Amino acid sequence: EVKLLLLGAGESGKSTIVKQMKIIHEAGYSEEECKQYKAVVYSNTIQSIIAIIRAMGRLKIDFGDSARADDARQLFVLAELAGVIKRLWKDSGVQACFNRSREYQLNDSAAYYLNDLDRIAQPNYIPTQQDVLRTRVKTTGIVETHFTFKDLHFKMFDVGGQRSERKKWIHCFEGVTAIIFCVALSDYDLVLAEDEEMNRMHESMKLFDSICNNKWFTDTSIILFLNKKDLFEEKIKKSPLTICYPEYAGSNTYEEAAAYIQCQFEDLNKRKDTKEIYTHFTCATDTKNVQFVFDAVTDVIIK
């Protein structure tokens, strides 16, 4: 028996890692399961394309084709709609505002789903597991989940990260064996939606610090997932780190940055001496990663 807790700031991957704890250590998602997500899929997909639209009407961008302005007038109506969206997804234009997502709030899967629409409009569509992992739903108040692995009983707690939620965390603080803190690597240039004026990796650091170092967690295994490496690894190829860290003097490469960052985080340990941090680089959506890692992880706890 085993209290596990997952923490992080908002949209860091937590709830996805919970999803796999389940595909991994159980059967995963069924059809009738897959199917109840159908509807999220679709939700997500709409709100994303819309937010891009919307966004253009602020950033003032211009569709590729004048033609697409009906298709847009008519997205809203509305909400054959796939047609619309497809069609828009592919305006040169809209894709410029999508490449600018960080001047706004767009979900992360926003392209995964959009880019795969033919596949999931066709009626009689059933989500896959990745389809399902890639979905978004805000976690609030806290969800417990059980499972046994390697012959422990894990009791897993899943919270929300927006700040507004952090409020209710303390009620889960007793008795904790392990924590997995998730950080979105790709956050290095985004600001917080609760607070446009905060960098998101900044806020994450703060928090980490406050957990890593919290007096309840002193005999707790602190595990840090840095995550979204997929996404990082792309970003990093065209947005620069100096944005989070204006003093980075390296080059911007997955390799070099990931590590700077690996680092800025690991140094907020105030007991580098007494207390170790066990850090992994993650893709919550990759099932094969995570499962890999979470083996690592447990065989640590075993301590």
Place this chain on the structure above:
Amino acid sequence: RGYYHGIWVGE
């Protein structure tokens, strides 16, 4: 100010 019980929640 900023914290909630060791926890950083924001100003």
